[PDB]
Every structure is written in structure tokens, then in C-alpha cells.
């Protein structure tokens, strides 16, 4: 989608959990500090459910992808709570910040 956008739309409904534009400790969503490449399922503290750490992917442009649009699906039983995104174009705006979330 947009970057800025999803930037500016996810920190209006994700950075309750997630506040990756700052030192925010892993609340109640982990900081997205770097996601694509960064292979989760291990994290060195707060690793989540046992539904997500069990998982141990790569966080890529397709996974990110399913999760977001269907999360409990996705993973069943995650602590993360959306289960829908807007309709198509969050699904990709989203995905498109953390595509730099990556590198910001
Ligand atoms: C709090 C109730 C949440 C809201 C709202 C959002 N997320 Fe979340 N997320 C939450 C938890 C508790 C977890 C842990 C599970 C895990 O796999 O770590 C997550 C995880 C993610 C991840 C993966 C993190 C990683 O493994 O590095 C992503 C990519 C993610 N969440 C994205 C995301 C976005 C963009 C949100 C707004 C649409 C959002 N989350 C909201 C809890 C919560």
C-alpha cells in the first residue's frame, strides 16, 4: 500500500501493543525491530505463547501477509488480538511500513 500510511495507521491501532518508534519494551506486542529476516520463535526474554514460539519463521513478505489478515488463523492461540485489518489496501499499506520498520 502507502508506507507513511501504514506507518501513520498502524501506530494509530498497533503501538498500543507495539511501540517500534521508540525504546518500548515487548508489553503486550514485541517491538518490530527489524522482522523481515529475523527469524522469530526465540526471543531472549518475552517469546510469547508457546503458539508462537513454536512457529520459527522468517517473518517474510507472504507470512507477515496471512498473519495480519488472519491472525488466529495464522497461529492458533497468539496473545495478539486483530482480526481483521480494514478490507485489502491496510493488509498491504502495513506491510509496507514494517517493510521499513526493517530499516528505520
Ligand atoms: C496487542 C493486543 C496487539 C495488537 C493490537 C497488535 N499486536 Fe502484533 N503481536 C501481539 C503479540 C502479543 C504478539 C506476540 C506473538 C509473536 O509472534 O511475537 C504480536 C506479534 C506481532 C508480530 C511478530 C513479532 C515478531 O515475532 O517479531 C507482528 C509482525 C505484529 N505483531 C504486527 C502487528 C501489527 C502491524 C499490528 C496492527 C495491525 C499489531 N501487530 C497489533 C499483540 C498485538
Given at each position: 500500500?502507502d508506507?507513511?500510511?501504514?506507518?501513520?495507521?498502524?501506530?494509530?491501532?498497533?503501538?498500543?501493543?507495539?511501540?517500534?518508534?521508540?525504546?518500548?519494551?515487548?508489553?503486550?506486542?514485541?517491538?518490530?525491530?527489524?522482522?523481515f529476516?529475523?527469524?522469530?520463535?526465540?526471543?531472549?526474554?518475552?517469546?510469547?505463547?508457546?503458539?508462537?514460539?513454536?512457529?520459527?519463521?522468517?517473518?517474510?513478505?507472504?507470512?507477515?501477509?496471512?498473519?495480519?489478515?488472519?491472525?488466529?488463523?495464522?497461529?492458533?492461540?497468539?496473545?495478539?488480538?486483530?482480526?481483521?485489518?480494514?478490507?485489502?489496501?491496510?493488509?498491504?499499506?502495513?506491510?509496507?511500513?514494517?517493510?521499513?520498520?526493517?530499516?528505520?
Open positions: 500500500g508506507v507513511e500510511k501504514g506507518k501513520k495507521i498502524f501506530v494509530q491501532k498497533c503501538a498500543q501493543c507495539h511501540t517500534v518508534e521508540k525504546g518500548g519494551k515487548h508489553k503486550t506486542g514485541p517491538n518490530l525491530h527489524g522482522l529476516g529475523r527469524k522469530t520463535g526465540q526471543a531472549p526474554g518475552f517469546t510469547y505463547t508457546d503458539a508462537n514460539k513454536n512457529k520459527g519463521i522468517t517473518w517474510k513478505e507472504e507470512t507477515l501477509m496471512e498473519y495480519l489478515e488472519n491472525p488466529k488463523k495464522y497461529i492458533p492461540g497468539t496473545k495478539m488480538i486483530f482480526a481483521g485489518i480494514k478490507k485489502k489496501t491496510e493488509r498491504e499499506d502495513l506491510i509496507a511500513y514494517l517493510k521499513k520498520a526493517t530499516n528505520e
